[PDB]
Amino acid sequence: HKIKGTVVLMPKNELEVNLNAFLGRSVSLQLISATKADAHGKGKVGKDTFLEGINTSLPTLGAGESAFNIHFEWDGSMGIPGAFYIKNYMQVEFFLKSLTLEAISNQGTIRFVCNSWVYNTKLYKSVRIFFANHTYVPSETPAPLVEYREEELKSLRGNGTGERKEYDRIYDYDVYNDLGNPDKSEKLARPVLGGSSTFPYPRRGRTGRGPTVTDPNTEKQGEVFYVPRDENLGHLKSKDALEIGTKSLSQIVQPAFESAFDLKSTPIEFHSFQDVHDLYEGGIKLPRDVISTIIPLPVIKELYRTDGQHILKFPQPHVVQVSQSAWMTDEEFAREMIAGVNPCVIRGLEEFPPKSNLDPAIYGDQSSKITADSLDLDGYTMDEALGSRRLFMLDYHDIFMPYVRQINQLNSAKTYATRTILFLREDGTLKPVAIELSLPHVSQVVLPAKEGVESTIWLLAKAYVIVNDSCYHQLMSHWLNTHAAMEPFVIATHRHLSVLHPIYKLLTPHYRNNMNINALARQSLINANGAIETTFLPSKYSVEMSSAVYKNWVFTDQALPADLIKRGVAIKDPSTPHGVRLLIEDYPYAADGLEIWAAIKTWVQEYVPLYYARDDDVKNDSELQHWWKEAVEKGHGDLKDKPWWPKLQTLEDLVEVCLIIIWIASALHAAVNFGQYPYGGLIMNRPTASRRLLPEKGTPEYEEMINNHEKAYLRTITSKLPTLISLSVIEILSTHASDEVYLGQRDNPHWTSDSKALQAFQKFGNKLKEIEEKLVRRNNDPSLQGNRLGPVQLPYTLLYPSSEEGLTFRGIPNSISI
Ligand SMILES: [Fe+3]
Numbered sequence: 001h002k003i004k005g006t007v008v009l010m011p012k013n014e015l016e017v018n019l020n021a022f023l024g025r026s027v028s029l030q031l032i033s034a035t036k037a038d039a040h041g042k043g044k045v046g047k048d049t050f051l052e053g054i055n056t057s058l059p060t061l062g063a064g065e066s067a068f069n070i071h072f073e074w075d076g077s078m079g080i081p082g083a084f085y086i087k088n089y090m091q092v093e094f095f096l097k098s099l100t101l102e103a104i105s106n107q108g109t110i111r112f113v114c115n116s117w118v119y120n121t122k123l124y125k126s127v128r129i130f131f132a133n134h135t136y137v138p139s140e141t142p143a144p145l146v147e148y149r150e151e152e153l154k155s156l157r158g159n160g161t162g163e164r165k166e167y168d169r170i171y172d173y174d175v176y177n178d179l180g181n182p183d184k185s186e187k188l189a190r191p192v193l194g195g196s197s198t199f200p201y202p203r204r205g206r207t208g209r210g211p212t213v214t215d216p217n218t219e220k221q222g223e224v225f226y227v228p229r230d231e232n233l234g235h236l237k238s239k240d241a242l243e244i245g246t247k248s249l250s251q252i253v254q255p256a257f258e259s260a261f262d263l264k265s266t267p268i269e270f271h272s273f274q275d276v277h278d279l280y281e282g283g284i285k286l287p288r289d290v291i292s293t294i295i296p297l298p299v300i301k302e303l304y305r306t307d308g309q310h311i312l313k314f315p316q317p318h319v320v321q322v323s324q325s326a327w328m329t330d331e332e333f334a335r336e337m338i339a340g341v342n343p344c345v346i347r348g349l350e351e352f353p354p355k356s357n358l359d360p361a362i363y364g365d366q367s368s369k370i371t372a373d374s375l376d377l378d379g380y381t382m383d384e385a386l387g388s389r390r391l392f393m394l395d396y397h398d399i400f401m402p403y404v405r406q407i408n409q410l411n412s413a414k415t416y417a418t419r420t421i422l423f424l425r426e427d428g429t430l431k432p433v434a435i436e437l438s439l440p441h442v443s444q445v446v447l448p449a450k451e452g453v454e455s456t457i458w459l460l461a462k463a464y465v466i467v468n469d470s471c472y473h474q475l476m477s478h479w480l481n482t483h484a485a486m487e488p489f490v491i492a493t494h495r496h497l498s499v500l501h502p503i504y505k506l507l508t509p510h511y512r513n514n515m516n517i518n519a520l521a522r523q524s525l526i527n528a529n530g531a532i533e534t535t536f537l538p539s540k541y542s543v544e545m546s547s548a549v550y551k552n553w554v555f556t557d558q559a560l561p562a563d564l565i566k567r568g569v570a571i572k573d574p575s576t577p578h579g580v581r582l583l584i585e586d587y588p589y590a591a592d593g594l595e596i597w598a599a600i601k602t603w604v605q606e607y608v609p610l611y612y613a614r615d616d617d618v619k620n621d622s623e624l625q626h627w628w629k630e631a632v633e634k635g636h637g638d639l640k641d642k643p644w645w646p647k648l649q650t651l652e653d654l655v656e657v658c659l660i661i662i663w664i665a666s667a668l669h670a671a672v673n674f675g676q677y678p679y680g681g682l683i684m685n686r687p688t689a690s691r692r693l694l695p696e697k698g699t700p701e702y703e704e705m706i707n708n709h710e711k712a713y714l715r716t717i718t719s720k721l722p723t724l725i726s727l728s729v730i731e732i733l734s735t736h737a738s739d740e741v742y743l744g745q746r747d748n749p750h751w752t753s754d755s756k757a758l759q760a761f762q763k764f765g766n767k768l769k770e771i772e773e774k775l776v777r778r779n780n781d782p783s784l785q786g787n788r789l790g791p792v793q794l795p796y797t798l799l800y801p802s803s804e805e806g807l808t809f810r811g812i813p814n815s816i817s818i
Contacts, residue, residue: 034082317681348568488635
């Protein structure tokens with residue numbers, strides 16, 4: 001009596017950047033019973049069974065997928081299959097998608113969703129096992145599968161030692177000691193981030209390459225930063241390997257650009273604003289050997305357009321797509337703090353002046369020098385303004401002040417720590433009314449002006465603010481709060497939740513490609529002399545600055561309502577549907593985000609109850625308790641003592657934790673990531689660095705400012721060479737791969753057998769299509785054009801759920817996938 005099976009797999013060549021060799025005795029499968037056990041209680045194991053033949057007569061197949069027939073001998077003593085071993089006897093690895101068994105059990109068909117690389121059987125200490133798609137909390141695991149379930153978890157965890165190899169599937173933690181390169185040079189040494197109270201930091205995935213020669217504390221370099229093999233995503237099309245673009249940029253392209261500036265083949269500085277707009281019109285002209293080193297590289301070559309010989313042209317940023325000059329206005333400057341690339345730092349102001357929390361013994365009186373009588377508040381008094389909650393601020397003073405001295409000693413960096421005061425006008429748009437530029441150890445207030453040298457000083461003051469915001473966005477809003485903060489949860493999930501676990505299935509789609517991009521970022525983006533260090537103001541202090549901000553990171557404050565309330569931009573109000581009332585009614589990021597938040601909340605609340613009926617059930621899930629214990633105590637271990645960590649003893653706790661993780665991975669990361677090039681592609685709108693302080697009265701710098709304001713700006717912001725590298729970086733980060741999996745989607749529709757979970761997930765996908773319509777309406781509502789479109793006429797679509805491939809300024813991926 002035979003069971004007919006179909007195996008779907010992808011050979012290696014199809015996923016990189018001969019089908020009959022799979023037949024014969026090359027690939028074996030053995031089924032494992034879920035209902036009949038041997039003496040020691042384990043599911044009985046069937047016989048080695050080999051792929052019989054190709055199956056071209058199957059219509060569901062996708063690109064690169066091939067199917068194979070197989071028939072198992074499975075008699076009455078064997079029971080119902082719930083798992084299977086596979087052994088690859090080929091020398092090459094292949095990517096196993098699924099096994100489908102026809103007509104055997106109560107539900108008839110048994111589906112195994114695998115999606116896993118299967119290397120030659122000699123490379124594995126234990127045989128590869130895969131489970132059917134039924135969901136089981138540990139207490140409901142069929143008894144003959146119990147031991148397998150735990151043994152695979154033990155295998156994923158490893159023993160905390162060893163150099164990790166390509167095919168390893170071992171998840172473990174380590175600190176950020178792999179960014180400095182002291183064996184090459186003592187100037188490339190970097191503090192270890194994590195495991196101390198000086199430099200607390202989230203953990204990253206352990207690689208085990210062992211110590212450098214000069215510093216035992218720092219991990220040595222490698223050509224390949226390991227991630228556990230199934231995190232290392234293959235792509236059908238080489239253009240979708242966006243993550244490897246950043247590696248090419250730093251190793252190949254940037255040294256090429258650097259040659260063209262050393263040989264004086266192009267002007268070393270921008271000289272007008274037109275020199276910058278040229279980048280996306282006539283292209284910049286370059287030596288032939290530089291273009292010939294760039295245009296053959298995959299991914300990199302998709303960024304620019306070229307004539308083959310001398311041109312590289314960048315695409316046109318969305319922000320200059322209607323007005324070339326609207327970025328320069330105070331209204332857009334202000335609007336981007338609520339509908340821009342970094343829309344989540346502005347705070348409400350309830351006392352005036354604002355005060356610093358810094359130690360006056362080290363910095364001085366840090367009471368703000370801004371006077372209430374110098375502000376033009378549209379006729380309001382200060383008391384009125386405060387009292388009707390119309391005053392706001394972008395306060396970077398306390399964050400940057402401890403680093404200004406260090407940064408200002410470097411050779412091509414000068415900055416201030418800035419505060420910006422904003423007033424909410426009766427028409428609902430924000431108005432900037434003052435900017436304070438502070439130094440430690442002059443520290444000036446600058447007021448809006450439209451005429452005279454004073455208006456140029458104001459323009460420059462706005463640039464220092466945005467330099468501040470750019471550093472904070474890249475390192476904090478984006479790198480720390482999404483990429484870095486999420487990796488520990490990824491590791492914990494694979495270590496302590498079985499593939500069988502309901503919460504494993506809920507969360508893992510929101511991890512896709514996360515460990516992989518971080519690994520490549522640790523190697524090329526945030527490493528010593530990497531792309532961030534060489535294009536952003538703080539140079540070698542960039543990453544360690546994120547450690548200072550992480551001291552105040554709070555997991556429960558990452559929930560959107562908690563965040564709006566913490567920042568003074570909303571108030572708790574149980575008469576609203578979302579439970580908060582916005583103090584800036586028309587706040588695009590928060591207003592759109594609250595719809596996404598609520599939809600995710602509904603999905604999570606409908607899913608958990610399918611597997612957990614009572615707080616008792618949560619408390620008694622050993623796998624769930626071990627996961628959460630480790631995530632806090634090891635993954636975010638330097639913050640394990642804090643009192644705000646949920647305890648995970650209640651249904652409500654479980655829903656809260658899952659909702660925060662999914663929020664961070666999908667919509668939060670999308671809102672801060674996918675506007676990077678649309679707004680920041682014009683280097684004058686989002687300068688990444690500043691190079692001098694304001695010119696002093698009676699100097700030729702000052703004279704220039706009066707005569708040529710464009711040159712005083714460009715001479716202040718990011719130089720030409722870093723501009724080219726950084727636009728390329730953010731053009732990559734802003735691009736959706738064609739193979740993205742967006743929110744409300746999943747790669748496989750049979751991820752679970754539970755028809756109830758599948759329907760709750762179908763309702764979620766609908767609710768998102770509905771919301772996307774509501775958001776399209778808002779962008780067309782002419783009452784909201786002041787904030788949603790602004791003078792640059794760029795509707796706020798970053799929180800549209802769906803999107804097509806490319807640089808689209810919309811679409812929420814499931815995960816931190818780039
Ligand atoms: Fe990102």
